[PDB]
Design a protein around this ligand. Structure first.
Ligand code: HEM
Ligand code: CA
Ligand code: CA
Length: 336
């Protein structure tokens, strides 16, 4: 054990510098430890930075990518040019300063900012945090980020290559529980992906399984599908992953328990944090991460909609018991 200059107790001396970052982020980046756009933007960044890792590319005789090496910040000039990394310039430049200023690696900062950002949203699990990733990285190979226009096979092959199973792909997507879209359908900027974009819960999995009956904007975006109610946006890849035979059962079990969903996500996020790295070579500083406020609310089927409105895609397994909320049907306001 060690006590930092600030008095904080921690499991290792290199966990001490992190208490100053945590202080910085919460105060400025997060405008007061808040669960808004910054946290959602950072979640896109952590996924997009880590996923630039392909053992298959390497085998083919090409640079496969450095995984969670912070190249998205280190080589933003190249990476932010990728169509998948739109609307991230400011989050990146914001993170770059914090990183330099505090002298921490970009790969560690992104991973740290993620665990910290998650704590600002009610119901989030306490994501593990390891420190010690090299500060040096190369730009990520293009075309390594799965898109909403991609097929389930495309997405699973890409994610499988990176090291994730179909079930883990579903688990990582629990992140869409705190999300919205700004560039898929600009007409309805920031339309939430679920009824609670500020609460880490199972609503995302539940609501994506409801029958698509609503077009929230003047038109149906390129990679957009009908949603269950006004204000909610449904991404084509999410709609397909929820119903595909290869992933439907995992998606289905992720609707009943907030704790289980949280467990699986944390296990998945911990997997993604060390892509291109050796766990043994990193120092655990998980104790620097604050706990998120509890989510006592239980899973429910929104606005007078019943379980019979759910398009059950894994009938081989019993559909979980979930409370049903009375109407009227909701109309989501844009994500804060
Ligand atoms: C596996 C296939 C995935 C696809 C196809 C996908 C796609 C997308 C897209 C196209 C948007 C809309 C961005 C915009 O127009 O603002 C979005 C939002 C978001 N995504 Fe994903 N995603 C995937 C996985 C993940 C993962 C694994 C994480 C992190 C663990 C993540 C976190 C987020 C968050 C928090 C937003 C919200 C951003 C905001 O409100 O500005 N996604 N995603
Ligand atoms: Ca990277
Ligand atoms: Ca939610």
């Amino acid at each position: 054990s060690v006590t930092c200059p600030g008095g904080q107790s921690t499991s290792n001396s290199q966990c001490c510098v992190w208490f100053d970052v945590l202080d910085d982020l919460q105060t400025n980046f997060y405008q007061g430890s808040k669960c808004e756009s910054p946290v959602r933007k950072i979640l896109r960044i952590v996924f997009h930075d880590a996923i630039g890792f392909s053992p298959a590319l390497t085998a083919a005789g090409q640079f496969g990518g450095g995984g969670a090496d912070g190249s998205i910040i280190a080589h933003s000039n190249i990476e932010l040019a990728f169509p998948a990394n739109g609307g991230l310039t400011d989050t990146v430049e914001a993170l770059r300063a914090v990183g330099i200023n505090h002298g921490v690696s970009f790969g560690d900062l992104i991973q740290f900012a993620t665990a910290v950002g998650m704590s600002n949203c009610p119901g989030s699990p306490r994501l593990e945090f390891l420190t010690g990733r090299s500060s040096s990285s190369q730009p990520s190979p293009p075309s390594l980020i799965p898109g909403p226009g991609n097929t389930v096979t495309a997405i699973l092959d890409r994610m499988g290559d990176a090291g994730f199973s179909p079930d883990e792909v579903v688990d990582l997507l629990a992140a869409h529980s705190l999300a919205s879209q700004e560039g898929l359908n600009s007409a309805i900027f920031r339309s939430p992906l679920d009824s609670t974009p500020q609460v880490f819960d199972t609503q995302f999995y539940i609501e994506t399984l409801l029958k698509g009956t609503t077009q929230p904007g003047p038109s149906l975006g390129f990679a957009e599908e009908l949603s269950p109610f006004p204000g909610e946006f449904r991404m084509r890849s999410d709609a397909l992953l929820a119903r595909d035979s290869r992933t439907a059962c995992r998606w289905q079990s992720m609707t009943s328990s907030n704790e289980v969903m949280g467990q699986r996500y944390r296990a998945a996020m911990a997997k993604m944090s060390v892509l291109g790295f050796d766990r043994n070579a990193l120092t655990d500083c998980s104790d620097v991460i604050p706990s998120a406020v509890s989510n006592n609310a239980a899973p429910v089927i929104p606005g007078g909609l019943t379980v019979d409105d759910i398009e059950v895609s894994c009938p081989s397994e019993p559909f979980p018991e979930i409370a049903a909320a009375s109407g009227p049907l909701p109309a989501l306001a844009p994500a804060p």
